[PDB]
Write a protein that binds this ligand. Structure first.
Ligand code: HEC
Length: 82
């Protein structure tokens, strides 16, 4: 259930990367712009449940399979990485 095991178990590493951008934003890019800030955790949690349109690059993201407890652990891991 942790962000390191959920990034490899769920289909997030297919489009996203750990350092450089592949098609959308990378884990190092979302942590550099939003480094543990209130408001960004709610926008990143609502973006994975509904979808993002024009924020990091030209490619959009569809609504991924994630619950309220998984969106809070994934939002806190992308803001503060291990
Ligand atoms: C390719 C089909 C993707 C997969 C699979 C996942 N994501 Fe994604 N994500 C993708 C793009 C192209 C973008 C940028 C969209 C834009 O308009 O710029 C994103 C963005 C995110 C974000 C940031 C949202 C924001 O800043 O508002 C997060 C937090 C994010 N993606 C998370 C995420 C997770 C947890 C995934 C596995 C369940 C996942 N993404 C898969 C493209 C793709």
């Amino acid at each position: 259930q942790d962000g390191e095991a959920l990034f490899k178990s769920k289909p997030c590493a297919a489009c996203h990367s750990v350092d450089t951008k592949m098609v959308g934003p990378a884990l190092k890019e979302v942590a550099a712009k939003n480094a543990g800030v209130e408001g960004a955790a709610d926008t990143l949690a609502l973006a994975i449940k509904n979808g993002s349109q024009g924020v990091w690059g030209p490619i959009p993201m569809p609504p991924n399979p994630v619950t309220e407890e998984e969106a809070k652990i994934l939002a806190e891991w992308v803001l503060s990485l291990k």
